[model samples]
Target: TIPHLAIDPFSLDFFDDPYPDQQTLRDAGPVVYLDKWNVYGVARYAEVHAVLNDPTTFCSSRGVGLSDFKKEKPWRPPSLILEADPPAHTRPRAVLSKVLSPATMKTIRDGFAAAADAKVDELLQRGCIDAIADLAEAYPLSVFPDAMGLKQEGREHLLPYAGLVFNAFGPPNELRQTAIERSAPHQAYVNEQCQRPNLAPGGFGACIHAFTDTGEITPDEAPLLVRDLLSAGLDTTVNGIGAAVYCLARFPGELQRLRSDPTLARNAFEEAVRFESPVQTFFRTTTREVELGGAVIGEGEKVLMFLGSANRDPRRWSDPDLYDITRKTSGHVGFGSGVHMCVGQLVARLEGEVMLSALARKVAAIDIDGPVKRRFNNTLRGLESLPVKLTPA
Candidate 1:
C-alpha cells in the first residue's frame, strides 16, 4: 500500500521551502502522489532523469506546467520548442542550435567577458552593493539584449514580461494574477517587437528570421521562438549570478578557492546551479501505467519532478548538501535531460563563466551585510536582494 505522504503543491510553506517535503517524498518512494495537485511527484534523481529523457512516455506537448495546455489558457502562444515534441520540435531547435553554436558563442565571448569584468570593477569600487541589482542584473541585461539584436524600444519590458509568463504557468492565483497585471500594458509592444522587420539585423533576432527564409520553420514561428529566448534568457541568468554570490559569501573558503583559479568558474556555476536549481520543478505527463519505486502511476496523470530536491538527494550525491566546485556534476538536471533538455544551455554557461570569472578577478572578498531575500517564483529559484560588501582585489 502507498504511504499517506501527500502534501499541498501550492501551499506557502512548499513554495517558500520545499526541501523538507521533497526529502520526505524521496525517502518514502521514487514516486509519491500529491493529492492536492493530483499529480505524481518524482523526488529521486534517477526517476526524474528517466521521465525527463523518455519524452515518448512523458510528453512535453501537454506542457511542462501544472495546468494542462489543452485545458488551461496558455500563457503565451505555446512555446515553439519548449511546447513541442519529436518532429515538430526538431527543425526550430536545429536552427537555433546551429546559430548559437560554439563558434558563434566564441565570437561574442571576449565582449561579454569585458562587459562582466567592467561591471564587477564598477561594483568593487562602490564597496557595498546589492549584488543582485548591481552586478547580477546589470551584466546580463546589458549583454543579452544586444546579443539578441533587439532594438532599444520596449526592451525594459523583457524581464517583467518573461516573469509574468513563467508565473502564469502555475495555478491562476494571486502570484499569477500579479504578474499578469504587471505585464498587461506591455503585451502588445512585446508581441510587435518579435516581428521580423522590427528586429535589428545581424542579431539573434535576424538569425531567427533567416531560419524562416531557409524554410526550416515558418515566418510566423520565428518571432515566437525569439520571444522564447528573450523570456527564458535574461532574468534567470541575472538571478543565477546573484545566487552564486550569495552561496560564495556563505562559504568564504570556497570563494577564495575559486578566486585562486579562474578556470573554476565553470564548476562553480554548475555547482551553484546544483546547489540551488534556477528552474526548480517542471511537470511531465504519464502516457501509461508506470511503476517507479513500487508506486504505480496511472495513465493521463501529471508528474512533477523536483529537480532542486534531486540535486541534493543523499542517496545519489556524496555530501549532497555541500557546495563542492570540484564534484562531477555533469548529469545534474540543472539544465535538465533527455530530448527537452535546455537547448540554450551553452549560452547560459558562457554567461555564467564570464560573469563569475569577472567578479573573481575584481573582488578579493565579499561579505554578506544582511539576510538574503529570495524571489518567489513558481519555476525559478532566485535571489531578490543579496546585500554584500565587495573587498576590491
Candidate 2:
C-alpha cells in the first residue's frame, strides 16, 4: 500500500487548474501511488530533485512518458537527444551543446535584442493587443526559425509539432489523439524542413549539419537533431513568455518593480518559470527496483515528477505561491535538472530577458483588457489569448 489515490492527472480538468490537485499530490507524501495511471508520482521538491538527478535509476530511454517504449511503439521515432540514454545521448548532446553554446548566443544577441525592441515598439503603438499572438508567439516565431535557417513559408508547423510531441508524453488521452490526427501534415512539413539542403548555409541548422564533417554525428543523425531544435525550442519559450506577462499583469506591484528597474527582467523571467512552470510534468521509468522517499518502486515503473509542484514546494521556498521577481530562484526545476536539463535554456533566457526588458523600457503598465483564455496541453501550461492594454512609459 504505497498511499494509492485515484486521480486522473492527465484529464482536462487537471490541466485547466492544477494547483489544488498539485497540492493534494504534494501533501500526500514525497512519493505516492497514482492508481489512475499506476504510476509513482513525486510532487515534493526533494524527491523530484532526487529522481531527476539520478537518471540512471529513473531512466528516460524507456520513454519519458506514460507509454513504455519496450511495450509500445512510439507514434513517431524517438528524439535522439530527448529519448536516449548515455553514450548514445552523449555525442548528440555534445554537438548541440557546442552549437548552442554561450558564444553562439552572444553572436545572436544583437539580432534578438533588436527584434524585441521593434516588437515592443509596435505593440505599444497598438495600445491593445493579444500578448500570446502579438508578443509571445510572435517574438519566438520571428527570431528562432530564422536563426535555424528555416524558410518563413512553412513556419506555421512548429507549434503543432511541439504540441504533438509534448502531448505524446502522456497517455492516449483525447488531447493526444486529436494532436495525433491534426499533426501528420505538420510533422511532414517539419521533417522536410530538417534536411540539409533545405537549411540556410549560415543558420543554426547548418551548424548542426556541420557536425557531420567532423564525424561528431552521422548524416542520417543530423536531421533528427535539427528536428530536436525545432521541437524543443519554440513552444516552451512561447509559454514561458506568456507566463511571465501573465504574472506581471496579475501582480501589478511586481510589474511596477520591473518598470522601475529594467535589470530585473531576467530575474522576472526566471521567477516566472518557477512560478508558472510551463513544462509541467514529465515521467521517468524506473530502471530497477528503487526506494525513494521510503517507497519501494519496482522496476519499469513510471514516476511522474510534478515539476510545477516541485517548484512551489513549501519545503524549498518561503511563500512559494507568490510571484516575486526579486526572489532568488536558484535550483528550481522549471527547466528540469541533471543531464537532461532543457538544452535550449540559454536561448530561451535570451528571448525572455530581451523581450521583457524591451517591454519594461517602453511600457509603464500591463492591464488586462479582456478575457484571458488558457491554452491547455497535457505537458505544457500557457495562455492562448491574453488581451491587454499597454500603458506607455
Candidate 3:
C-alpha cells in the first residue's frame, strides 16, 4: 500500500513555511497518498524526475491540477503545452520551440541587459527599496510585456492572473477562490491581448499567432497557446528573481562569492531557483497502472510532484540546505526536467544574468533593511516583500 498522509500541503501554513512539511513528505516514502487531498505525492528527487520524463505514462492532458478537466469544467481553457500530451502537444511545442530558440533569445538579450542595468541603477540611486517591488516584480513586469507586445494599460493585471493560474492547481480553497475573483478582469484582458490585432507584430504573442498559417496551430488554438507564454513568462520569473535577491541578502558570503566571479550570475540565479523553487507543485495523472517506489499507481488518479522538496532532498545533494553558488545546479528540478521542462527559463536566465552581472559591477553589498514577508499561493513560493539596502561598489 502507498504510504498515506492526511496533510494539506496547500494550506497557508504550509505555504508560509514549507520546508518542514516538505521534509515530512520526502521522508514518508517516494510516493505518499495525501488522503486529505486524495492525491498521490512524490517528494524524492528520483521519483519526481522520472515522472517528468515519462509523460506518456504520467500524462499531462487530463489536467495538471486537482480538478481533472476530463471530469470538471476547467476554470479556463487548458494550456496547450503544460496540460497537453503527445501528438497534440507536438505542434504547440514546436511553435514555441522556434519562438524561444537560442537565436531568438539573442534578439532580446541586448534589450533585457539595458533594462536590467537601468533598473539596478535606479535601485542604487534610491539606496533602499523593497527588492520584490523594485527589482523582482518590477524588472519582469517592465520587460515581459514589451517583449510580448502586451498593452501597457492595465498591465498590473498580469501578476494577479498569474497568481490565479498557479493557485488554481490546488483544491478549491480560499486562496484559489480569491485569485479567481481578483484575476477575472485581468484574465479577460489577457485573452484580448492574445488576439492578432491587439499584439505587436514583432513580439512573442504575434509570433505564436503566426503559427496558424503553417497549420502548426489552428486560428482558434492560437490564443490558448499564447496564454501559456503570458502566464509562464511573468509568474515564475518574478519568484525566481525574488528568491535570488532574498538568497543573496541572507547569505552575504555567497553574495560576495558571486560578486568576485561576475560570470556566476547565471549560476547564482539557477542556484537561487533550486534553493527556493518558485514553481513548487505540479500534478500529473497516471496514464495506466504504473509502478513508482515499488508500488502500483492506477490510471486516472493524480500524483502531485513536490518539485521544491525534490530540489532540496539530501539524497540528491550534499549540504542540500545551504545556499552555495558553486554547486552543480544543472539537474535541479527547480526549472523542472525532461519533456515538459520550462520553455521560458532561458529568457529568465538572461534576465537574471544581466541584472546580477550589472549589480556586480556597481553594487558593493546587499543587506536586509527590514523583516521579510512571504507571499502565499497554492502552487508557487515567493517573497511578498524583501526590504533591502544596497551599497555601491
Candidate 4:
C-alpha cells in the first residue's frame, strides 16, 4: 500500500528542518513514491545502500540530477569521473586515487592541523563568532584552492558557485534560476581555469593537466573533472564543519565529553554528519524494470535517494534522533555508499576534525548566541550563519 504525506519536500519549511517528514517516510516503508516529484524514494538505510551500490541497475550516467540526462538539457558535460560507470570511470578514478592516496593525505595532515589551530586561536580571541563564516568557511577556503594549486584571487566565489551547481541538480525552480544568475559572471573565470597554462604548479588542477599529458584522459576531459573537484570539494566541507560546530555547541555536554578525550572530536564530527547529512539527496535512474521494497520501478524511471533520512533510519540507528558522539554509526550513509561515494571525503574529514579539534582546544565552551540560519539548496543541507560564543580556554 502507498503511504501519503501532507508535506511537500521542496517547500522552505521542509528544507528548514526535514526530520519529522523524513521520519514519517522512513516509518512508512523502505521505499515510497512521492507523487509530487513523480520519483520513487528510498528513505531507509538498507534500501539507499542497495540502490547506490547497484549501479548496473541504477545508473549514474543519465546523471544524478532530478532531470534524466537522456531527455533533459545538461548544465555541463556530466562529470566524466562522477557520472561514468566502472570501465569508463576506472582510469580517471585510478589517476585521482593515486593523487589523493593516504600517503599524500598524510603529507598534508600536519599543515592542515596547524592551519586549524591558528584559525581557532584567532576566533577564540574574538569571544563570540559566526562559526559558519569564521571557522567553517575560513578553513576550507584556506586549504583546498592552495592544495589544488589554484591562486586565491577568485576563491571567495567557490562556495556560492558550488551551492548553485548542486541546487541546479534539482527541479528548475526559482532557486535554480537564482543560482544560474549568480554564477553567470563567474562562469568565464571557471571555464578559463580549466586550461593547463592557467593552473598554478602543484595544485590538483595542475595534476589533472599532467594526467591529460600522460594520455590517461583526454585534454578536453581535464578541466571538467577538475571543475567537479572544485565544485564538490569546497562547500560540502564548509557545511559539514558548520554542522559539527552547531551540534557540539548545542550539546555542550557532548563537547565536554569530547574535551576530556579530544579523540572524540573525530567521532563528534562523524556523528554530526550522520545526524545532519550535508548532502541530503541525489538521483538515480533504473536501467531495466526493477522491484525495490516491493514496488515496481519501471525502466528509465528516476529515483531519489533521501540520504539524510536513511542516515537517521530508526531501524538502523537506536535513538536515531539523539546526537551522541559515542554511538556506533559505522554503516551510516552520510558520505553515501557505492562507487559514486565522495572521492575527496578523507580531505573533508581531515578539514573538519582539525578545525573542530583546534576550536575545542582554544575555546573553554561554545554556545549559540542567536538562531542558526540555513542556506537551502536542492541537494545540500547547509548553514548560512551559526552565531556562537567561544569562551577562552
lDDT of 3 at 391: 94
- Candidate 4: RMSD to truth: 1.5
Candidate topping lDDT: 2
TM-score of each: 0.96, 0.98, 0.98, 0.96
Model 1 lDDT tens row, 1-393: 555555865556677888887788888877787776677888889988888888887888888888787677676678888888888999988888877788789888988989988888888778879988887788888899999888888888888877776776666667777787756666777788789888778888888888887888898889888877877888778767777887888888888889999899988998998988888888887777877667777877788888888898987999988888888998999888987788787788888998889767777898998677878877787878888898987
Candidate 1 Cα misplacement greater than 4 A, ranges:
none
Tens-digit per-residue lDDT, 193-218, candidate 2: 98999999888899999999987899
Q: Which prediction has more favorable lDDT, 3 or 4?
A: 3
Q: Model 3 Cα displacement at 195 (Å)?
A: 0.1
Tell me the spans in candidate 4 whose CA falls farther than 4 Å from its real position: 4-6
Segments of candidate 2 deviating more than 4 angstroms: none
- Model 4 TM-score relative to the real fold: 0.96
Q: Candidate 1 lDDT (Cα, whole model)?
A: 0.82
Give the alpha-carbon lDDT of every model.
0.82, 0.92, 0.88, 0.83
Q: What is the full ranking by lDDT, best candidate first?
A: 2, 3, 4, 1
**TM-score of model 1 (CA atoms):** 0.96
Which model is ahead, 2 or 3, in terms of TM-score?
A: 2
